[PDB]
Amino acid sequence: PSYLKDDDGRSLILRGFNTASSAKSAPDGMPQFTEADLAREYADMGTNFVRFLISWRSVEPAPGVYDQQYLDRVEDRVGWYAERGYKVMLDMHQDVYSGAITPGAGAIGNGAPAWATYMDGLPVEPQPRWELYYIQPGVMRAFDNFWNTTGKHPELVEHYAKAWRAVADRFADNDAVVAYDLMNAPFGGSLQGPAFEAGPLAAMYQRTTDAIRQVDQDTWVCVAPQAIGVNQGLPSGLTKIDDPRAGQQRIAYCPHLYPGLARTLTDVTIDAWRANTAHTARVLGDVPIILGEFGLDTTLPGARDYIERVYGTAREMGAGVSYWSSDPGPWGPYLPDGTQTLLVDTLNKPYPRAVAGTPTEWSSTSDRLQLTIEPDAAITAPTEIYLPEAGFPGDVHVEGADVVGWDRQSRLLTVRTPADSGNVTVTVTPAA
Numbered sequence: 001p002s003y004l005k006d007d008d009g010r011s012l013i014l015r016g017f018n019t020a021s022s023a024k025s026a027p028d029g030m031p032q033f034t035e036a037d038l039a040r041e042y043a044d045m046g047t048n049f050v051r052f053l054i055s056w057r058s059v060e061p062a063p064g065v066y067d068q069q070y071l072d073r074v075e076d077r078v079g080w081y082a083e084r085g086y087k088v089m090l091d092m093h094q095d096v097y098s099g100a101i102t103p104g105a106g107a108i109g110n111g112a113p114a115w116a117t118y119m120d121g122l123p124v125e126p127q128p129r130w131e132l133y134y135i136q137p138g139v140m141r142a143f144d145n146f147w148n149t150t151g152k153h154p155e156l157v158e159h160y161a162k163a164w165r166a167v168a169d170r171f172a173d174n175d176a177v178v179a180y181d182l183m184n185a186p187f188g189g190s191l192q193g194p195a196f197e198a199g200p201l202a203a204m205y206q207r208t209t210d211a212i213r214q215v216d217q218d219t220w221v222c223v224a225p226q227a228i229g230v231n232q233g234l235p236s237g238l239t240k241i242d243d244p245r246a247g248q249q250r251i252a253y254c255p256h257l258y259p260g261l262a263r264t265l266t267d268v269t270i271d272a273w274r275a276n277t278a279h280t281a282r283v284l285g286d287v288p289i290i291l292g293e294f295g296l297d298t299t300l301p302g303a304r305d306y307i308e309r310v311y312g313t314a315r316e317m318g319a320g321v322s323y324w325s326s327d328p329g330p331w332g333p334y335l336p337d338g339t340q341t342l343l344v345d346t347l348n349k350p351y352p353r354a355v356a357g358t359p360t361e362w363s364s365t366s367d368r369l370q371l372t373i374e375p376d377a378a379i380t381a382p383t384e385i386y387l388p389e390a391g392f393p394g395d396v397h398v399e400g401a402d403v404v405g406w407d408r409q410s411r412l413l414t415v416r417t418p419a420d421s422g423n424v425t426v427t428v429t430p431a432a
């Protein structure tokens with residue numbers, strides 16, 4: 001398994017949230033999420049990652065005209081993350097194309113600006129569940145116009161690529177920004193399956209990557225498969241994307257996961273998903289994997305077991321994870337009054353954040369972490385590990401490594417391992 005790396009070459013294990021679905025409808029493009037809310041998230045779970053929702057309608061409110069005041073706002077929020085040691089993936093988010101699909105901000109449909117939305121007078125009648133808007137004639141049309149399946153709008157993917165370039169231009173020298181997730185939940189309209197993914201989807205990813213690389217050579221470009229089918233464990237037809245940057249490719253794979261009998265189904269679905277994800281990660285060039293979206297109603301029986309099974313699969317796969325989502329509700333870490341859900345204790349586990357070498361295997365319980373590293377002598381920065389206070393209330397006991405520092409406030413343990421002695425196993429336990 002492959003990993004994104006920080007500037008010191010350490011391999012990243014990414015744990016965080018999607019922040020946030022409230023941005024979809026916000027006039028100013030921002031989530032209802034404050035610097036205090038991040039401090040709570042950090043205090044409670046020690047997260048080191050966010051998938052941060054941005055929008056094309058906010059980037060490019062008119063054709064060819066980028067809103068630098070919106071990018072200022074995004075940059076302000078990234079600043080919060082940066083100050084608490086987070087890595088940031090920016091997600092160009094849409095669902096159901098645009099808020100402009102009924103009488104581009106919106107709570108349901110969201111993403112593209114009005115000027116880029118061409119339903120051509122075709123209906124979008126109300127539906128019992130929101131996902132059904134996808135197949136309504138005007139939405140199918142909005143998408144066919146975007147991918148130029150109609151031949152009527154070749155300019156749209158060109159505007160899209162250059163709106164992404166405007167964003168990368170602002171963030172190219174931001175040390176907190178590590179990834180650009182190019183399109184949330186790609187939907188092909190009248191095109192589905194590999195003819196979509198190998199077709200206009202890949203062709204957009206290529207143009208967009210290329211445009212981003214005019215102004216940002218180092219940020220990882222993350223690509224997703226088509227959402228329908230692949231979310232549920234079907235194989236993707238996505239083809240390799242070329243990274244024009246000098247040296248090694250920086251493309252990662254950013255799939256979603258949305259699966260007595262109901263349990264067995266869910267179990268084989270995760271197995272199917274892992275095998276399919278691992279395949280496409282190989283096709284794209286043995287790329288790092290980020291599980292960009294997964295979540296559920298935490299109040300449903302069997303929820304924690306499912307969450308834990310997903311996170312263990314992510315761990316085994318070397319994947320990053322951004323949970324859907326930080327918004328208040330029974331899916332998130334906190335109910336609206338601020339009360340913790342079962343997710344908080346479930347997620348609040350020790351984990352290596354930045355490893356001085358390749359993590360080959362690791363495990364953690366609430367009062368033990370074990371990690372095996374494949375050495376790298378060119379790395380001088382220490383291995384950095386998060387330890388929760390419940391399980392590690394004082395000092396640490398470390399075997400297989402020397403303690404460089406133990407910050408009991410930030411909860412970051414830094415250790416140094418031998419690089420000239422093969423694979424190293426570090427074990428961390430609370431001091432007697």
Ligand SMILES: *[C@H]1O[C@H](CO)[C@@H](O[C@@H]2O[C@H](CO)[C@H](O)[C@H](O)[C@H]2O)[C@H](O)[C@H]1O
Binds near residue numbers: 109110184256324
């Ligand atoms: C993947 O799946 C998520 C859960 O279904 C989506 O979030 C949902 O989006 C809808 C429509 O916009 C509403 O905002 C829901 O509140 C929200 O949970 C993600 O958008 C999608 O990428």
Ligand code: NA
Binds near residue numbers: 173174
């Ligand atoms: Na950066």
